[PDB]
């Protein structure tokens, strides 16, 4: 594995969860048992390392 960068759009493959985008700051309160979140547009909106 390797680290991640912000404001530079890249591809992310978290254990089979694949996607492309910028990895920017999360600023919303989440439940402790979350693995990943979604937005209104049915898209993977949040990711946890």
């Amino acid at each position: 594995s390797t680290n991640l960068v912000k404001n530079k759009c890249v591809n992310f493959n978290f254990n089979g969860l694949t996607g492309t985008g910028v990895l920017t700051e999360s600023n919303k309160k989440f439940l402790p048992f979350q693995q990943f979140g979604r937005d209104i547009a049915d898209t993977t909106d949040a990711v946890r390392d």
């Binding site: 985008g21 547009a41 049915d42 898209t43």
Partner: peptide, 22 residues
């Protein structure tokens, strides 16, 4: 109020209008 009463990256592209909203 017309603008306010009226209330995205999945391969589609909402091309901005040639004539700007302004």
């Amino acid at each position: 109020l017309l603008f306010n009463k009226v209330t995205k990256f999945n391969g589609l592209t909402v091309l901005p209008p040639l004539l700007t909203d302004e």
